[PDB]
Amino acid sequence: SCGCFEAIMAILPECNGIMITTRDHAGMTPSGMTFSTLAGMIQTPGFMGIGRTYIVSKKFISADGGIARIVWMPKSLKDFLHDEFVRRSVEEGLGEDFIDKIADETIGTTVDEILPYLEEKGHPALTMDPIM
Ligand code: NI
Ligand code: NI
């Protein structure tokens, strides 16, 4: 949370997961804010500024579920980490196709449009321990 972070992650209580947006993504996100807005008040409780590399680390939010908690990411971020992410998805036992269960602006920018999708795809985060 200094000022070099390429991405920001926020908790999405309604999806029992977390979202992630990036510095170069201008879209609105399920948290009701763009990266710019989140950046303007970043470390607060509920969200933190991070390096994209962190996302594919064995340590990534380890205590709270790791990768499994991610329900939304910009398509561009998925592309940037794809190979790395699929790898981690497999080692975590989520299946190589886990990345396709994660929503993006290709599905929606709000919780309301996203939940339906997460349910259809049987996203793991919906049946895990309460994120909080
Ligand atoms: Ni920082
Ligand atoms: Ni920084």
Side-chain angles (χ1 to χ4, degrees), residues 70-97:
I70 303 167
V71 300
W72 193 96
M73 284 187 290
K75 187 68 182 61
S76 65
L77 173 58
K78 280 182 186 178
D79 289 336
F80 178 96
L81 300 175
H82 194 271
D83 295 343
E84 310 272 36
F85 197 88
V86 174
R87 200 161 317 193
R88 296 290 297 98
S89 294
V90 179
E91 308 181 334
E92 296 292 315
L94 300 176
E96 57 190 66
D97 69 321

mmCIF file with all atom_site columns, all heavy atoms in Angstrom, residues 70-97:
data_model
loop_
_atom_site.group_PDB
_atom_site.id
_atom_site.type_symbol
_atom_site.label_atom_id
_atom_site.label_alt_id
_atom_site.label_comp_id
_atom_site.label_asym_id
_atom_site.label_entity_id
_atom_site.label_seq_id
_atom_site.pdbx_PDB_ins_code
_atom_site.Cartn_x
_atom_site.Cartn_y
_atom_site.Cartn_z
_atom_site.occupancy
_atom_site.B_iso_or_equiv
_atom_site.pdbx_formal_charge
_atom_site.auth_seq_id
_atom_site.auth_comp_id
_atom_site.auth_asym_id
_atom_site.auth_atom_id
_atom_site.pdbx_PDB_model_num
ATOM 1   N N   . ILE A 1 70 ? -10.932 -15.462 -5.075  1.00 0.00 ? 70 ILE A N   1
ATOM 2   C CA  . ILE A 1 70 ? -11.076 -14.522 -6.164  1.00 0.00 ? 70 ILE A CA  1
ATOM 3   C C   . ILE A 1 70 ? -12.285 -14.812 -7.026  1.00 0.00 ? 70 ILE A C   1
ATOM 4   O O   . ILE A 1 70 ? -12.384 -15.869 -7.647  1.00 0.00 ? 70 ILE A O   1
ATOM 5   C CB  . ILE A 1 70 ? -9.848  -14.499 -7.065  1.00 0.00 ? 70 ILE A CB  1
ATOM 6   C CG1 . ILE A 1 70 ? -8.594  -14.174 -6.253  1.00 0.00 ? 70 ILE A CG1 1
ATOM 7   C CG2 . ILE A 1 70 ? -10.054 -13.464 -8.159  1.00 0.00 ? 70 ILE A CG2 1
ATOM 8   C CD1 . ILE A 1 70 ? -7.301  -14.434 -7.020  1.00 0.00 ? 70 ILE A CD1 1
ATOM 9   N N   . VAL A 1 71 ? -13.200 -13.852 -7.080  1.00 0.00 ? 71 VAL A N   1
ATOM 10  C CA  . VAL A 1 71 ? -14.394 -14.018 -7.877  1.00 0.00 ? 71 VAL A CA  1
ATOM 11  C C   . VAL A 1 71 ? -14.454 -13.041 -9.041  1.00 0.00 ? 71 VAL A C   1
ATOM 12  O O   . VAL A 1 71 ? -15.216 -13.258 -9.978  1.00 0.00 ? 71 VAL A O   1
ATOM 13  C CB  . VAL A 1 71 ? -15.668 -13.871 -7.013  1.00 0.00 ? 71 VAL A CB  1
ATOM 14  C CG1 . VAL A 1 71 ? -15.656 -14.935 -5.917  1.00 0.00 ? 71 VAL A CG1 1
ATOM 15  C CG2 . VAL A 1 71 ? -15.737 -12.480 -6.405  1.00 0.00 ? 71 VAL A CG2 1
ATOM 16  N N   . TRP A 1 72 ? -13.648 -11.980 -9.007  1.00 0.00 ? 72 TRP A N   1
ATOM 17  C CA  . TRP A 1 72 ? -13.660 -11.012 -10.106 1.00 0.00 ? 72 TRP A CA  1
ATOM 18  C C   . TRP A 1 72 ? -12.281 -10.421 -10.385 1.00 0.00 ? 72 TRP A C   1
ATOM 19  O O   . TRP A 1 72 ? -11.538 -10.097 -9.466  1.00 0.00 ? 72 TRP A O   1
ATOM 20  C CB  . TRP A 1 72 ? -14.637 -9.884  -9.783  1.00 0.00 ? 72 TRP A CB  1
ATOM 21  C CG  . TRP A 1 72 ? -14.974 -8.994  -10.931 1.00 0.00 ? 72 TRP A CG  1
ATOM 22  C CD1 . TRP A 1 72 ? -16.060 -9.087  -11.753 1.00 0.00 ? 72 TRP A CD1 1
ATOM 23  C CD2 . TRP A 1 72 ? -14.250 -7.839  -11.355 1.00 0.00 ? 72 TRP A CD2 1
ATOM 24  N NE1 . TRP A 1 72 ? -16.063 -8.054  -12.664 1.00 0.00 ? 72 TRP A NE1 1
ATOM 25  C CE2 . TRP A 1 72 ? -14.961 -7.272  -12.442 1.00 0.00 ? 72 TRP A CE2 1
ATOM 26  C CE3 . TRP A 1 72 ? -13.069 -7.220  -10.925 1.00 0.00 ? 72 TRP A CE3 1
ATOM 27  C CZ2 . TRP A 1 72 ? -14.528 -6.115  -13.099 1.00 0.00 ? 72 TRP A CZ2 1
ATOM 28  C CZ3 . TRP A 1 72 ? -12.641 -6.065  -11.580 1.00 0.00 ? 72 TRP A CZ3 1
ATOM 29  C CH2 . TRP A 1 72 ? -13.369 -5.529  -12.653 1.00 0.00 ? 72 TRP A CH2 1
ATOM 30  N N   . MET A 1 73 ? -11.931 -10.305 -11.659 1.00 0.00 ? 73 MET A N   1
ATOM 31  C CA  . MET A 1 73 ? -10.646 -9.718  -12.058 1.00 0.00 ? 73 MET A CA  1
ATOM 32  C C   . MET A 1 73 ? -10.810 -9.117  -13.443 1.00 0.00 ? 73 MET A C   1
ATOM 33  O O   . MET A 1 73 ? -11.648 -9.557  -14.215 1.00 0.00 ? 73 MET A O   1
ATOM 34  C CB  . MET A 1 73 ? -9.528  -10.764 -12.131 1.00 0.00 ? 73 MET A CB  1
ATOM 35  C CG  . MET A 1 73 ? -8.981  -11.214 -10.807 1.00 0.00 ? 73 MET A CG  1
ATOM 36  S SD  . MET A 1 73 ? -7.539  -12.292 -11.059 1.00 0.00 ? 73 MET A SD  1
ATOM 37  C CE  . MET A 1 73 ? -8.323  -13.779 -11.739 1.00 0.00 ? 73 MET A CE  1
ATOM 38  N N   . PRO A 1 74 ? -10.023 -8.096  -13.776 1.00 0.00 ? 74 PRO A N   1
ATOM 39  C CA  . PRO A 1 74 ? -10.262 -7.609  -15.128 1.00 0.00 ? 74 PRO A CA  1
ATOM 40  C C   . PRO A 1 74 ? -9.728  -8.675  -16.075 1.00 0.00 ? 74 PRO A C   1
ATOM 41  O O   . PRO A 1 74 ? -8.803  -9.413  -15.719 1.00 0.00 ? 74 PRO A O   1
ATOM 42  C CB  . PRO A 1 74 ? -9.443  -6.321  -15.179 1.00 0.00 ? 74 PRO A CB  1
ATOM 43  C CG  . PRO A 1 74 ? -9.366  -5.892  -13.727 1.00 0.00 ? 74 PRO A CG  1
ATOM 44  C CD  . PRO A 1 74 ? -9.123  -7.199  -13.036 1.00 0.00 ? 74 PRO A CD  1
ATOM 45  N N   . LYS A 1 75 ? -10.308 -8.768  -17.266 1.00 0.00 ? 75 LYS A N   1
ATOM 46  C CA  . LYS A 1 75 ? -9.850  -9.739  -18.252 1.00 0.00 ? 75 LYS A CA  1
ATOM 47  C C   . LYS A 1 75 ? -8.331  -9.572  -18.491 1.00 0.00 ? 75 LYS A C   1
ATOM 48  O O   . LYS A 1 75 ? -7.591  -10.562 -18.576 1.00 0.00 ? 75 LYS A O   1
ATOM 49  C CB  . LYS A 1 75 ? -10.608 -9.536  -19.571 1.00 0.00 ? 75 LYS A CB  1
ATOM 50  C CG  . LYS A 1 75 ? -10.328 -10.596 -20.630 1.00 0.00 ? 75 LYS A CG  1
ATOM 51  C CD  . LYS A 1 75 ? -10.886 -11.963 -20.223 1.00 0.00 ? 75 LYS A CD  1
ATOM 52  C CE  . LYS A 1 75 ? -10.560 -13.036 -21.258 1.00 0.00 ? 75 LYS A CE  1
ATOM 53  N NZ  . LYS A 1 75 ? -9.081  -13.217 -21.427 1.00 0.00 ? 75 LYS A NZ  1
ATOM 54  N N   . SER A 1 76 ? -7.876  -8.325  -18.591 1.00 0.00 ? 76 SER A N   1
ATOM 55  C CA  . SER A 1 76 ? -6.459  -8.035  -18.829 1.00 0.00 ? 76 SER A CA  1
ATOM 56  C C   . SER A 1 76 ? -5.556  -8.648  -17.756 1.00 0.00 ? 76 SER A C   1
ATOM 57  O O   . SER A 1 76 ? -4.470  -9.144  -18.056 1.00 0.00 ? 76 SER A O   1
ATOM 58  C CB  . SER A 1 76 ? -6.225  -6.514  -18.886 1.00 0.00 ? 76 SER A CB  1
ATOM 59  O OG  . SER A 1 76 ? -6.487  -5.863  -17.638 1.00 0.00 ? 76 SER A OG  1
ATOM 60  N N   . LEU A 1 77 ? -5.999  -8.616  -16.504 1.00 0.00 ? 77 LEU A N   1
ATOM 61  C CA  . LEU A 1 77 ? -5.188  -9.173  -15.433 1.00 0.00 ? 77 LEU A CA  1
ATOM 62  C C   . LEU A 1 77 ? -5.152  -10.691 -15.563 1.00 0.00 ? 77 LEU A C   1
ATOM 63  O O   . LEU A 1 77 ? -4.136  -11.315 -15.267 1.00 0.00 ? 77 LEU A O   1
ATOM 64  C CB  . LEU A 1 77 ? -5.733  -8.757  -14.068 1.00 0.00 ? 77 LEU A CB  1
ATOM 65  C CG  . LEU A 1 77 ? -5.043  -9.431  -12.881 1.00 0.00 ? 77 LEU A CG  1
ATOM 66  C CD1 . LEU A 1 77 ? -3.557  -9.136  -12.919 1.00 0.00 ? 77 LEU A CD1 1
ATOM 67  C CD2 . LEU A 1 77 ? -5.664  -8.954  -11.572 1.00 0.00 ? 77 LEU A CD2 1
ATOM 68  N N   . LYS A 1 78 ? -6.262  -11.284 -16.000 1.00 0.00 ? 78 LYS A N   1
ATOM 69  C CA  . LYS A 1 78 ? -6.313  -12.733 -16.199 1.00 0.00 ? 78 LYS A CA  1
ATOM 70  C C   . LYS A 1 78 ? -5.309  -13.097 -17.278 1.00 0.00 ? 78 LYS A C   1
ATOM 71  O O   . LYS A 1 78 ? -4.607  -14.096 -17.173 1.00 0.00 ? 78 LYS A O   1
ATOM 72  C CB  . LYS A 1 78 ? -7.688  -13.201 -16.685 1.00 0.00 ? 78 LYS A CB  1
ATOM 73  C CG  . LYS A 1 78 ? -8.770  -13.334 -15.632 1.00 0.00 ? 78 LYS A CG  1
ATOM 74  C CD  . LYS A 1 78 ? -10.045 -13.845 -16.290 1.00 0.00 ? 78 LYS A CD  1
ATOM 75  C CE  . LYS A 1 78 ? -11.218 -13.867 -15.325 1.00 0.00 ? 78 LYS A CE  1
ATOM 76  N NZ  . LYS A 1 78 ? -12.465 -14.326 -16.004 1.00 0.00 ? 78 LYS A NZ  1
ATOM 77  N N   . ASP A 1 79 ? -5.247  -12.283 -18.325 1.00 0.00 ? 79 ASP A N   1
ATOM 78  C CA  . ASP A 1 79 ? -4.322  -12.576 -19.411 1.00 0.00 ? 79 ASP A CA  1
ATOM 79  C C   . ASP A 1 79 ? -2.872  -12.486 -18.964 1.00 0.00 ? 79 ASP A C   1
ATOM 80  O O   . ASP A 1 79 ? -2.060  -13.320 -19.342 1.00 0.00 ? 79 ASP A O   1
ATOM 81  C CB  . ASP A 1 79 ? -4.566  -11.645 -20.607 1.00 0.00 ? 79 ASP A CB  1
ATOM 82  C CG  . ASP A 1 79 ? -5.865  -11.963 -21.344 1.00 0.00 ? 79 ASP A CG  1
ATOM 83  O OD1 . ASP A 1 79 ? -6.336  -13.122 -21.259 1.00 0.00 ? 79 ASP A OD1 1
ATOM 84  O OD2 . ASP A 1 79 ? -6.409  -11.057 -22.020 1.00 0.00 ? 79 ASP A OD2 1
ATOM 85  N N   . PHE A 1 80 ? -2.565  -11.488 -18.143 1.00 0.00 ? 80 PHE A N   1
ATOM 86  C CA  . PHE A 1 80 ? -1.212  -11.267 -17.645 1.00 0.00 ? 80 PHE A CA  1
ATOM 87  C C   . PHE A 1 80 ? -0.689  -12.376 -16.743 1.00 0.00 ? 80 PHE A C   1
ATOM 88  O O   . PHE A 1 80 ? 0.514   -12.613 -16.693 1.00 0.00 ? 80 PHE A O   1
ATOM 89  C CB  . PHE A 1 80 ? -1.144  -9.924  -16.887 1.00 0.00 ? 80 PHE A CB  1
ATOM 90  C CG  . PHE A 1 80 ? 0.214   -9.626  -16.283 1.00 0.00 ? 80 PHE A CG  1
ATOM 91  C CD1 . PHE A 1 80 ? 1.127   -8.824  -16.960 1.00 0.00 ? 80 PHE A CD1 1
ATOM 92  C CD2 . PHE A 1 80 ? 0.597   -10.191 -15.064 1.00 0.00 ? 80 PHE A CD2 1
ATOM 93  C CE1 . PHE A 1 80 ? 2.406   -8.592  -16.440 1.00 0.00 ? 80 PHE A CE1 1
ATOM 94  C CE2 . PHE A 1 80 ? 1.870   -9.965  -14.536 1.00 0.00 ? 80 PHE A CE2 1
ATOM 95  C CZ  . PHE A 1 80 ? 2.779   -9.163  -15.230 1.00 0.00 ? 80 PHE A CZ  1
ATOM 96  N N   . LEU A 1 81 ? -1.587  -13.041 -16.025 1.00 0.00 ? 81 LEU A N   1
ATOM 97  C CA  . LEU A 1 81 ? -1.208  -14.089 -15.090 1.00 0.00 ? 81 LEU A CA  1
ATOM 98  C C   . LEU A 1 81 ? -1.604  -15.487 -15.540 1.00 0.00 ? 81 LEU A C   1
ATOM 99  O O   . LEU A 1 81 ? -1.166  -16.482 -14.949 1.00 0.00 ? 81 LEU A O   1
ATOM 100 C CB  . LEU A 1 81 ? -1.874  -13.846 -13.733 1.00 0.00 ? 81 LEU A CB  1
ATOM 101 C CG  . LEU A 1 81 ? -1.639  -12.586 -12.910 1.00 0.00 ? 81 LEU A CG  1
ATOM 102 C CD1 . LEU A 1 81 ? -2.561  -12.636 -11.695 1.00 0.00 ? 81 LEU A CD1 1
ATOM 103 C CD2 . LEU A 1 81 ? -0.181  -12.490 -12.478 1.00 0.00 ? 81 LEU A CD2 1
ATOM 104 N N   . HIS A 1 82 ? -2.439  -15.560 -16.569 1.00 0.00 ? 82 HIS A N   1
ATOM 105 C CA  . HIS A 1 82 ? -2.952  -16.838 -17.050 1.00 0.00 ? 82 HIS A CA  1
ATOM 106 C C   . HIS A 1 82 ? -2.122  -18.075 -16.719 1.00 0.00 ? 82 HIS A C   1
ATOM 107 O O   . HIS A 1 82 ? -2.457  -18.814 -15.796 1.00 0.00 ? 82 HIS A O   1
ATOM 108 C CB  . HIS A 1 82 ? -3.232  -16.780 -18.552 1.00 0.00 ? 82 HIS A CB  1
ATOM 109 C CG  . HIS A 1 82 ? -4.057  -17.930 -19.040 1.00 0.00 ? 82 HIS A CG  1
ATOM 110 N ND1 . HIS A 1 82 ? -3.499  -19.114 -19.474 1.00 0.00 ? 82 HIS A ND1 1
ATOM 111 C CD2 . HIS A 1 82 ? -5.399  -18.103 -19.097 1.00 0.00 ? 82 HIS A CD2 1
ATOM 112 C CE1 . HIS A 1 82 ? -4.464  -19.966 -19.778 1.00 0.00 ? 82 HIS A CE1 1
ATOM 113 N NE2 . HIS A 1 82 ? -5.626  -19.377 -19.557 1.00 0.00 ? 82 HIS A NE2 1
ATOM 114 N N   . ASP A 1 83 ? -1.038  -18.303 -17.450 1.00 0.00 ? 83 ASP A N   1
ATOM 115 C CA  . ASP A 1 83 ? -0.212  -19.479 -17.196 1.00 0.00 ? 83 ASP A CA  1
ATOM 116 C C   . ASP A 1 83 ? 0.128   -19.660 -15.716 1.00 0.00 ? 83 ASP A C   1
ATOM 117 O O   . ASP A 1 83 ? -0.011  -20.758 -15.170 1.00 0.00 ? 83 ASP A O   1
ATOM 118 C CB  . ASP A 1 83 ? 1.070   -19.425 -18.030 1.00 0.00 ? 83 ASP A CB  1
ATOM 119 C CG  . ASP A 1 83 ? 0.794   -19.511 -19.524 1.00 0.00 ? 83 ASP A CG  1
ATOM 120 O OD1 . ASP A 1 83 ? -0.324  -19.925 -19.909 1.00 0.00 ? 83 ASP A OD1 1
ATOM 121 O OD2 . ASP A 1 83 ? 1.695   -19.169 -20.321 1.00 0.00 ? 83 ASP A OD2 1
ATOM 122 N N   . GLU A 1 84 ? 0.557   -18.583 -15.070 1.00 0.00 ? 84 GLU A N   1
ATOM 123 C CA  . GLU A 1 84 ? 0.909   -18.630 -13.652 1.00 0.00 ? 84 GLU A CA  1
ATOM 124 C C   . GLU A 1 84 ? -0.307  -19.045 -12.827 1.00 0.00 ? 84 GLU A C   1
ATOM 125 O O   . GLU A 1 84 ? -0.224  -19.914 -11.957 1.00 0.00 ? 84 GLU A O   1
ATOM 126 C CB  . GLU A 1 84 ? 1.375   -17.246 -13.186 1.00 0.00 ? 84 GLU A CB  1
ATOM 127 C CG  . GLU A 1 84 ? 2.435   -16.606 -14.072 1.00 0.00 ? 84 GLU A CG  1
ATOM 128 C CD  . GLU A 1 84 ? 3.837   -16.994 -13.664 1.00 0.00 ? 84 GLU A CD  1
ATOM 129 O OE1 . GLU A 1 84 ? 4.029   -18.157 -13.233 1.00 0.00 ? 84 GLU A OE1 1
ATOM 130 O OE2 . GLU A 1 84 ? 4.744   -16.135 -13.784 1.00 0.00 ? 84 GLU A OE2 1
ATOM 131 N N   . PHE A 1 85 ? -1.443  -18.421 -13.124 1.00 0.00 ? 85 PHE A N   1
ATOM 132 C CA  . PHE A 1 85 ? -2.682  -18.670 -12.404 1.00 0.00 ? 85 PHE A CA  1
ATOM 133 C C   . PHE A 1 85 ? -3.231  -20.086 -12.587 1.00 0.00 ? 85 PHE A C   1
ATOM 134 O O   . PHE A 1 85 ? -3.673  -20.708 -11.616 1.00 0.00 ? 85 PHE A O   1
ATOM 135 C CB  . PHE A 1 85 ? -3.721  -17.624 -12.826 1.00 0.00 ? 85 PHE A CB  1
ATOM 136 C CG  . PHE A 1 85 ? -4.888  -17.505 -11.881 1.00 0.00 ? 85 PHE A CG  1
ATOM 137 C CD1 . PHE A 1 85 ? -4.829  -16.639 -10.791 1.00 0.00 ? 85 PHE A CD1 1
ATOM 138 C CD2 . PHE A 1 85 ? -6.043  -18.253 -12.076 1.00 0.00 ? 85 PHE A CD2 1
ATOM 139 C CE1 . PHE A 1 85 ? -5.897  -16.518 -9.915  1.00 0.00 ? 85 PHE A CE1 1
ATOM 140 C CE2 . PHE A 1 85 ? -7.113  -18.138 -11.208 1.00 0.00 ? 85 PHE A CE2 1
ATOM 141 C CZ  . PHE A 1 85 ? -7.040  -17.265 -10.122 1.00 0.00 ? 85 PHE A CZ  1
ATOM 142 N N   . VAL A 1 86 ? -3.210  -20.594 -13.819 1.00 0.00 ? 86 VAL A N   1
ATOM 143 C CA  . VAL A 1 86 ? -3.708  -21.943 -14.080 1.00 0.00 ? 86 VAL A CA  1
ATOM 144 C C   . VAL A 1 86 ? -2.862  -22.932 -13.277 1.00 0.00 ? 86 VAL A C   1
ATOM 145 O O   . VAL A 1 86 ? -3.390  -23.849 -12.652 1.00 0.00 ? 86 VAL A O   1
ATOM 146 C CB  . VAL A 1 86 ? -3.646  -22.284 -15.597 1.00 0.00 ? 86 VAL A CB  1
ATOM 147 C CG1 . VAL A 1 86 ? -4.024  -23.750 -15.837 1.00 0.00 ? 86 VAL A CG1 1
ATOM 148 C CG2 . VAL A 1 86 ? -4.593  -21.362 -16.373 1.00 0.00 ? 86 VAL A CG2 1
ATOM 149 N N   . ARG A 1 87 ? -1.549  -22.721 -13.282 1.00 0.00 ? 87 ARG A N   1
ATOM 150 C CA  . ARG A 1 87 ? -0.615  -23.564 -12.538 1.00 0.00 ? 87 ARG A CA  1
ATOM 151 C C   . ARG A 1 87 ? -1.091  -23.650 -11.083 1.00 0.00 ? 87 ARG A C   1
ATOM 152 O O   . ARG A 1 87 ? -1.414  -24.736 -10.577 1.00 0.00 ? 87 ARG A O   1
ATOM 153 C CB  . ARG A 1 87 ? 0.779   -22.937 -12.591 1.00 0.00 ? 87 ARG A CB  1
ATOM 154 C CG  . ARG A 1 87 ? 1.955   -23.858 -12.298 1.00 0.00 ? 87 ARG A CG  1
ATOM 155 C CD  . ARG A 1 87 ? 3.234   -23.221 -12.855 1.00 0.00 ? 87 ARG A CD  1
ATOM 156 N NE  . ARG A 1 87 ? 2.988   -22.648 -14.189 1.00 0.00 ? 87 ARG A NE  1
ATOM 157 C CZ  . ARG A 1 87 ? 3.930   -22.252 -15.050 1.00 0.00 ? 87 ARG A CZ  1
ATOM 158 N NH1 . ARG A 1 87 ? 5.215   -22.360 -14.737 1.00 0.00 ? 87 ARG A NH1 1
ATOM 159 N NH2 . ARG A 1 87 ? 3.586   -21.746 -16.232 1.00 0.00 ? 87 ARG A NH2 1
ATOM 160 N N   . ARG A 1 88 ? -1.145  -22.489 -10.424 1.00 0.00 ? 88 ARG A N   1
ATOM 161 C CA  . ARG A 1 88 ? -1.575  -22.398 -9.031  1.00 0.00 ? 88 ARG A CA  1
ATOM 162 C C   . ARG A 1 88 ? -2.956  -23.005 -8.810  1.00 0.00 ? 88 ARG A C   1
ATOM 163 O O   . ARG A 1 88 ? -3.216  -23.592 -7.766  1.00 0.00 ? 88 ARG A O   1
ATOM 164 C CB  . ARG A 1 88 ? -1.574  -20.935 -8.576  1.00 0.00 ? 88 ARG A CB  1
ATOM 165 C CG  . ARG A 1 88 ? -0.198  -20.295 -8.576  1.00 0.00 ? 88 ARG A CG  1
ATOM 166 C CD  . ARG A 1 88 ? 0.718   -20.838 -7.471  1.00 0.00 ? 88 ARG A CD  1
ATOM 167 N NE  . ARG A 1 88 ? 0.191   -20.547 -6.139  1.00 0.00 ? 88 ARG A NE  1
ATOM 168 C CZ  . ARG A 1 88 ? -0.512  -21.404 -5.404  1.00 0.00 ? 88 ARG A CZ  1
ATOM 169 N NH1 . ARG A 1 88 ? -0.767  -22.622 -5.863  1.00 0.00 ? 88 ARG A NH1 1
ATOM 170 N NH2 . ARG A 1 88 ? -0.982  -21.039 -4.218  1.00 0.00 ? 88 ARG A NH2 1
ATOM 171 N N   . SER A 1 89 ? -3.839  -22.860 -9.792  1.00 0.00 ? 89 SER A N   1
ATOM 172 C CA  . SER A 1 89 ? -5.182  -23.418 -9.684  1.00 0.00 ? 89 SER A CA  1
ATOM 173 C C   . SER A 1 89 ? -5.096  -24.933 -9.586  1.00 0.00 ? 89 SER A C   1
ATOM 174 O O   . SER A 1 89 ? -5.811  -25.556 -8.807  1.00 0.00 ? 89 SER A O   1
ATOM 175 C CB  . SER A 1 89 ? -6.016  -23.034 -10.902 1.00 0.00 ? 89 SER A CB  1
ATOM 176 O OG  . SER A 1 89 ? -6.248  -21.639 -10.943 1.00 0.00 ? 89 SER A OG  1
ATOM 177 N N   . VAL A 1 90 ? -4.209  -25.523 -10.377 1.00 0.00 ? 90 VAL A N   1
ATOM 178 C CA  . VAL A 1 90 ? -4.031  -26.973 -10.369 1.00 0.00 ? 90 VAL A CA  1
ATOM 179 C C   . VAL A 1 90 ? -3.416  -27.471 -9.060  1.00 0.00 ? 90 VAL A C   1
ATOM 180 O O   . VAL A 1 90 ? -3.893  -28.448 -8.481  1.00 0.00 ? 90 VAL A O   1
ATOM 181 C CB  . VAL A 1 90 ? -3.135  -27.442 -11.541 1.00 0.00 ? 90 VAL A CB  1
ATOM 182 C CG1 . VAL A 1 90 ? -2.964  -28.959 -11.486 1.00 0.00 ? 90 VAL A CG1 1
ATOM 183 C CG2 . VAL A 1 90 ? -3.746  -27.026 -12.867 1.00 0.00 ? 90 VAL A CG2 1
ATOM 184 N N   . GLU A 1 91 ? -2.365  -26.801 -8.592  1.00 0.00 ? 91 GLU A N   1
ATOM 185 C CA  . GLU A 1 91 ? -1.711  -27.206 -7.346  1.00 0.00 ? 91 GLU A CA  1
ATOM 186 C C   . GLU A 1 91 ? -2.647  -27.072 -6.144  1.00 0.00 ? 91 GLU A C   1
ATOM 187 O O   . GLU A 1 91 ? -2.461  -27.740 -5.123  1.00 0.00 ? 91 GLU A O   1
ATOM 188 C CB  . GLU A 1 91 ? -0.461  -26.362 -7.086  1.00 0.00 ? 91 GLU A CB  1
ATOM 189 C CG  . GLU A 1 91 ? 0.520   -26.292 -8.241  1.00 0.00 ? 91 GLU A CG  1
ATOM 190 C CD  . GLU A 1 91 ? 1.746   -25.460 -7.902  1.00 0.00 ? 91 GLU A CD  1
ATOM 191 O OE1 . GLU A 1 91 ? 1.626   -24.561 -7.032  1.00 0.00 ? 91 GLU A OE1 1
ATOM 192 O OE2 . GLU A 1 91 ? 2.817   -25.693 -8.513  1.00 0.00 ? 91 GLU A OE2 1
ATOM 193 N N   . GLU A 1 92 ? -3.648  -26.204 -6.269  1.00 0.00 ? 92 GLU A N   1
ATOM 194 C CA  . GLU A 1 92 ? -4.601  -25.970 -5.187  1.00 0.00 ? 92 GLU A CA  1
ATOM 195 C C   . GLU A 1 92 ? -5.792  -26.918 -5.259  1.00 0.00 ? 92 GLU A C   1
ATOM 196 O O   . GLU A 1 92 ? -6.618  -26.961 -4.342  1.00 0.00 ? 92 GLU A O   1
ATOM 197 C CB  . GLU A 1 92 ? -5.116  -24.532 -5.231  1.00 0.00 ? 92 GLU A CB  1
ATOM 198 C CG  . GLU A 1 92 ? -4.076  -23.453 -4.986  1.00 0.00 ? 92 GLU A CG  1
ATOM 199 C CD  . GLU A 1 92 ? -3.538  -23.449 -3.571  1.00 0.00 ? 92 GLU A CD  1
ATOM 200 O OE1 . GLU A 1 92 ? -4.344  -23.545 -2.621  1.00 0.00 ? 92 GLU A OE1 1
ATOM 201 O OE2 . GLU A 1 92 ? -2.305  -23.335 -3.410  1.00 0.00 ? 92 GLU A OE2 1
ATOM 202 N N   . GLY A 1 93 ? -5.881  -27.669 -6.356  1.00 0.00 ? 93 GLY A N   1
ATOM 203 C CA  . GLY A 1 93 ? -6.980  -28.604 -6.534  1.00 0.00 ? 93 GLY A CA  1
ATOM 204 C C   . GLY A 1 93 ? -8.282  -27.914 -6.907  1.00 0.00 ? 93 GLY A C   1
ATOM 205 O O   . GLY A 1 93 ? -9.358  -28.268 -6.416  1.00 0.00 ? 93 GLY A O   1
ATOM 206 N N   . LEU A 1 94 ? -8.188  -26.920 -7.782  1.00 0.00 ? 94 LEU A N   1
ATOM 207 C CA  . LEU A 1 94 ? -9.371  -26.187 -8.199  1.00 0.00 ? 94 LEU A CA  1
ATOM 208 C C   . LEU A 1 94 ? -9.667  -26.501 -9.658  1.00 0.00 ? 94 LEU A C   1
ATOM 209 O O   . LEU A 1 94 ? -10.695 -26.084 -10.201 1.00 0.00 ? 94 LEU A O   1
ATOM 210 C CB  . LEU A 1 94 ? -9.150  -24.680 -8.007  1.00 0.00 ? 94 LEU A CB  1
ATOM 211 C CG  . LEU A 1 94 ? -8.847  -24.215 -6.579  1.00 0.00 ? 94 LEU A CG  1
ATOM 212 C CD1 . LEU A 1 94 ? -8.561  -22.714 -6.551  1.00 0.00 ? 94 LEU A CD1 1
ATOM 213 C CD2 . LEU A 1 94 ? -10.031 -24.550 -5.684  1.00 0.00 ? 94 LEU A CD2 1
ATOM 214 N N   . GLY A 1 95 ? -8.766  -27.250 -10.286 1.00 0.00 ? 95 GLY A N   1
ATOM 215 C CA  . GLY A 1 95 ? -8.964  -27.585 -11.680 1.00 0.00 ? 95 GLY A CA  1
ATOM 216 C C   . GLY A 1 95 ? -8.350  -26.503 -12.541 1.00 0.00 ? 95 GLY A C   1
ATOM 217 O O   . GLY A 1 95 ? -8.324  -25.331 -12.160 1.00 0.00 ? 95 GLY A O   1
ATOM 218 N N   . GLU A 1 96 ? -7.852  -26.889 -13.708 1.00 0.00 ? 96 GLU A N   1
ATOM 219 C CA  . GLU A 1 96 ? -7.222  -25.944 -14.610 1.00 0.00 ? 96 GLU A CA  1
ATOM 220 C C   . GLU A 1 96 ? -8.210  -24.896 -15.117 1.00 0.00 ? 96 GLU A C   1
ATOM 221 O O   . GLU A 1 96 ? -7.818  -23.795 -15.512 1.00 0.00 ? 96 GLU A O   1
ATOM 222 C CB  . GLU A 1 96 ? -6.613  -26.706 -15.791 1.00 0.00 ? 96 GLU A CB  1
ATOM 223 C CG  . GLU A 1 96 ? -7.628  -27.555 -16.544 1.00 0.00 ? 96 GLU A CG  1
ATOM 224 C CD  . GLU A 1 96 ? -6.991  -28.495 -17.556 1.00 0.00 ? 96 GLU A CD  1
ATOM 225 O OE1 . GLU A 1 96 ? -6.266  -29.429 -17.136 1.00 0.00 ? 96 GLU A OE1 1
ATOM 226 O OE2 . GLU A 1 96 ? -7.221  -28.302 -18.775 1.00 0.00 ? 96 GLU A OE2 1
ATOM 227 N N   . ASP A 1 97 ? -9.493  -25.232 -15.086 1.00 0.00 ? 97 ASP A N   1
ATOM 228 C CA  . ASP A 1 97 ? -10.521 -24.327 -15.583 1.00 0.00 ? 97 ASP A CA  1
ATOM 229 C C   . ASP A 1 97 ? -11.049 -23.363 -14.525 1.00 0.00 ? 97 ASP A C   1
ATOM 230 O O   . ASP A 1 97 ? -11.983 -22.605 -14.789 1.00 0.00 ? 97 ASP A O   1
ATOM 231 C CB  . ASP A 1 97 ? -11.688 -25.131 -16.170 1.00 0.00 ? 97 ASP A CB  1
ATOM 232 C CG  . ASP A 1 97 ? -12.459 -25.882 -15.106 1.00 0.00 ? 97 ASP A CG  1
ATOM 233 O OD1 . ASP A 1 97 ? -11.815 -26.418 -14.180 1.00 0.00 ? 97 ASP A OD1 1
ATOM 234 O OD2 . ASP A 1 97 ? -13.704 -25.942 -15.195 1.00 0.00 ? 97 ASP A OD2 1
#
